[PDB]
Amino acid sequence: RSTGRSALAVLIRACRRIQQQLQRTRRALFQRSNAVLTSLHHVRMLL
Amino acid sequence: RSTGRSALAVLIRACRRIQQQLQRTRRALFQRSNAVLTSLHHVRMLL
Amino acid sequence: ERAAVLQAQRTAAAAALENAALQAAELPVDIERRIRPIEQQVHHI
Amino acid sequence: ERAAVLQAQRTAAAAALENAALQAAELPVDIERRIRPIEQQVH
Amino acid sequence: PPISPEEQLTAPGGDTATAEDVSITQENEEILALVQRRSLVEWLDRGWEALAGGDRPDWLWSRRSISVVLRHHYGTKQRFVVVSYENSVAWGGRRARPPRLSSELATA
């Protein structure tokens, strides 16, 4: 049991931590471009 | 056989599609982010 | 007469600033459509 | 009196392009490090 | 190859807090691990103290951390440079007083 299942605890955690960063790459990449959305509208706000 | 390998394809077909599910997020982020700076190239043609 | 020149240069690029703004606001639409099907696979497998 | 101001605001908006274009110089950059070394893990 | 100083302006890279960029890499090398299962700067001083023959505190911060940022001028469409060393008590230095600047009015 410690060879068959223990070849799988290697490969259950492997997929379940690739999928968790993909929640955090949605959030840490547009809150840098929302400041770009602030400044690009701010160029006409100068005008 | 069926006690050890019938649940492998749950972890196998998951680990053979995130190659495809995230490379489709590559080009759809490089078919859609280049158009912003190209529109910003248009502003330099006017200003 | 320079007021006739510079206001036309301001407002025509101001639509181009909005043609940039309607292209730059298309960018946060992207991954909010990309990983929302990839966030499906999380707790299941 | 307007024509100097209407030029100086226009020169600012011309400079605010490359103030924002160099600020938008990360939009084809911030995506490669958040996708590419993650797919060979899936491999 | 030569050292091109203009590429330090035109290569799109800057500062990051990187604490979010360690957890995004620790949960990225973890899967790889599962599958598998005196400094050089002190020798730079004698590099200068033998070739020059002296200390030269002008050149002492040419060995330490140097950021070279490009910005632009709102009056005549021009460019200019924003500089911060490491040991500068000036802005962007890594030896300065915590109360510095806040980009809050530029966001409010």
Swiss-Prot record, chains A, B:
Q: Which residues of the full protein are shown?
A: 3075 to 3121 of 3122
What's the protein name?
Large tegument protein deneddylase
Task: Report the record's disulfide bonds.
Answer: none
Q: Which family does it belong to?
A: Belongs to the herpesviridae large tegument protein family.
Q: What is the recorded post-translational modification?
A: Proteolytically processed, possibly into several polypeptides. Enzymatic activity is only detectable following cleavage of the UL36 protein, which occurs late during viral replication.
Under the subunit heading, UniProt states: Interacts with host CUL1 and CUL4A; these interactions inhibit the E3 ligase activity of cullins. Interacts with inner tegument protein. Interacts with capsid vertex specific component CVC2. Interacts with the major capsid protein/MCP.
| Localization terms from the record | Virion tegument; Host cytoplasm; Host nucleus
What function does the entry list? Large tegument protein that plays multiple roles in the viral cycle. During viral entry, remains associated with the capsid while most of the tegument is detached and participates in the capsid transport toward the host nucleus. Plays a role in the routing of the capsid at the nuclear pore complex and subsequent uncoating. Within the host nucleus, acts as a deneddylase and promotes the degradation of nuclear CRLs (cullin-RING ubiquitin ligases) and thereby stabilizes nuclear CRL substrates, while cytoplasmic CRLs remain unaffected.
State the organism of origin. Answer: Human herpesvirus 2 (strain HG52)
Q: Which domain of life is it from?
A: Viruses
UniProtKB/Swiss-Prot annotation, chain C:
Localization of this protein: Virion; Host nucleus
The superkingdom of the source organism is Viruses
**Role:** Capsid vertex-specific component that plays a role during viral DNA encapsidation, assuring correct genome cleavage and presumably stabilizing capsids that contain full-length viral genomes. Participates in the interaction between the capsid and the tegument through interaction with the large tegument protein/LTP.
**What does the subunit comment say?**
Heterodimerizes with CVC1. Interacts with major capsid protein/MCP and triplex capsid protein 1/TRX1 at the pentamer vertices. Interacts with the large tegument protein/LTP.
Could you say which protein family the record assigns here?
Answer: Belongs to the herpesviridae CVC2 protein family.
Protein name stated in the entry: Capsid vertex component 2
Organism for this UniProt entry? Human herpesvirus 2 (strain HG52) (HHV-2)
Q: What gene name is given for the protein in this entry?
A: CVC2
What stretch of the whole protein does this chain cover?
Answer: 50 to 94 of 585
UniProtKB/Swiss-Prot annotation, chain E:
Its annotated compartments are:
Virion; Host nucleus
Source taxon at top rank = Viruses
Q: How does it assemble?
A: Interacts (via C-terminus) with capsid vertex component 2/CVC2.
What job does the chain carry out? Capsid vertex-specific component that plays a role during viral DNA encapsidation, assuring correct genome cleavage and presumably stabilizing capsids that contain full-length viral genomes.
Q: Which family does it belong to?
A: Belongs to the herpesviridae CVC1 protein family.
From the Swiss-Prot or TrEMBL record, give the protein name: Capsid vertex component 1
Q: Which organism is it from?
A: Human herpesvirus 2 (strain HG52)
Intact protein stretch covered?
227 to 422 of 702
